[PDB]
Amino acid sequence: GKNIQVVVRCRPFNLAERKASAHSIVECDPVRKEVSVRTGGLADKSSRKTYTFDMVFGASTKQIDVYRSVVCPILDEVIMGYNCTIFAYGQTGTGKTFTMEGERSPNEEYTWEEDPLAGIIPRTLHQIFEKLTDNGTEFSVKVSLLEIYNEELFDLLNPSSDVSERLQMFDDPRNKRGVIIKGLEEITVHNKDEVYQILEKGAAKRTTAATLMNAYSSRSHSVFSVTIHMKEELVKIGKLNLVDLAGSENNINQSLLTLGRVITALVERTPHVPYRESKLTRILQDSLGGRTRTSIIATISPASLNLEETLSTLEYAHRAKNILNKPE
Ligand SMILES: CON(C)C(=O)N1N=C(c2cc(F)ccc2F)S[C@@]1(CCCN)c1ccccc1
Ligand SMILES: Nc1ncnc2c1ncn2[C@@H]1O[C@H](COP(=O)(O)OP(=O)(O)O)[C@@H](O)[C@H]1O
Ligand SMILES: [Mg+2]
């Protein structure tokens, strides 16, 4: 009996916004875990909409704070042999990818292990090896990376040199809420020093996919899966899904569209839940009311221009707090 945990992260003003003299309409209070939105513009200076969350990160939050506070507890439950999912949800430009992946600091000032701008994926891989090596247990780590665009499936770590070769998806007859990704390459990570070269190749395939399909970065969903096998004889198996969704400001929007419908259906206790109607909600079905521990990172902008999309994100995120999973 475990509810889905949801956090909110507000980014600082960007440069376009500073030049346009944007006003803030967001107040993020981490102590009381509240986000408050100024909704009345020039007409009603006093009206607000306020939501309470499991945690709230204001503009000044460092990447390392997201990792320590959110990723470590989940990583520990993966090392204990459970299934866990984290996805970033919010409008384009609000920090979904900065949170899940991060950036490299310019001028080559840092190693990739120490860069303060790295996000969840690079820290998770480095720290899995740190925790288990010189910890006394036998383990193998494998990772995969598929992407969803226009309800087609692409393998961004595949040995094939053409990124456009499509994957295919079938119900898993071994697990009642799972899928099989026919064709998906799973690459073994032998140690921490292999982590960066694997990311490099996936980044290169992503760049080429951008030249082939319209608005690729913002209309595709990203699913980075790491699986851990541990032998202590007692052998546990953990799996962690790290998902970066497409922009929530929306043929093409089918997974995003269904995802809301699926959420509304679970929290309204409707009988039939339309998991089957999109590729995304099929992959994530054990993560939306199944037996997987799930956490949502909802990203938003402080600027007045984005009032409607900020409200839309908060309401979707707040409503998903009412969904229960039953992990292992
Ligand atoms: C240019 O060199 N490369 C390959 C990188 O810088 N990275 N590769 C990443 C990555 C790639 C994927 F295909 C899938 C998932 C991922 F997380 S993470 C990232 C940043 C990527 C841009 N957001 C990074 C690592 C370490 C410190 C700071 C940033
Ligand atoms: N939390 C943050 N702190 C500082 N800068 C951020 C933050 N989140 C996003 N940004 C900046 O905003 C830009 C867009 O963020 P990104 O993650 O690419 O958006 P999306 O939500 O579309 O993936 C990036 O260039 C990044 O530098
Ligand atoms: Mg993006």
Q: What is the CATH number of the domain that holds 133?
A: 3.40.850.10
Ligand nearest to the CA of 218: 3
Q: Whose CA is nearest to atom 2 of ligand 1?
A: 200
Q: How far apart are CA 36 and CA 290, in angstroms?
A: 31
96 CA from centroid of ligand 3 (Å): 6
Q: How many domains does the chain divide into?
A: 1
Output the CA torsion 128→171→148→236 (10° steps).
0
**Tokens read off for 319:** 């409503």
- Nearest ligand atom owner, CA of 217: 3
| Structural domain boundaries, residue 14 | 2-325
Q: What is the resolution of this structure in A?
A: 2.8
Rounded CA separation 296/317 (Å) = 8
User: Interior CA angle at 68 toward 65 and 73, to 5°?
Assistant: 145
DSSP-assigned letter for residue 17:
H
Q: Is there an atom of ligand 1 within 6 Å of 200 CB?
A: yes
299 is in an annotated binding site: no
- Can you tell me the distance from the alpha carbon of 96 to that of 124, in angstroms, rounded to the nearest whole number? 16
What Å distances lie between residue 323 and 77, 283, 311, CA to CA?
19, 17, 20
Q: Determine whether the shortest distance from the Cβ of 206 to ligand 1 is under 6 A.
A: yes
Nearest CA to ligand 2 atom 16: 95
Contact 84, 240 (CB under 8 A): yes
Beta strands in 186-272, from DSSP E residues, in sequence order: 187-189, 221-231, 235-244
Distance 12 CA to ligand 2 centre (A): 9
Going by alpha carbons, the residue nearest to atom 3 of ligand 2 is: 11
- Of 125, 128, 116, nearest in space to 64 by CA: 116
What length is written for the chain? 328
Q: Which residues contact 26 (CB under 8 A, 6 or more apart)?
A: 10, 35, 36, 37, 38, 300, 301, 302, 310
Solved how? X-ray
Q: Choose one of 63, 87, 104, 146 to mutate for the ligand 1 pocket test, by most ligand atoms within 8 angstroms of C-beta.
A: 104
172 with 286: CB under 8 angstroms?
no
Q: Where are the beta strands (DSSP E) in 97-178?
A: 138-149, 152-155, 168-171
User: Distance (Å, rounded) from C-alpha 172 to C-alpha 187?
Assistant: 21
**What's the token pair of residue 268?**
């309204």
Q: Is the CB of 202 under 6 A from ligand 1?
A: yes
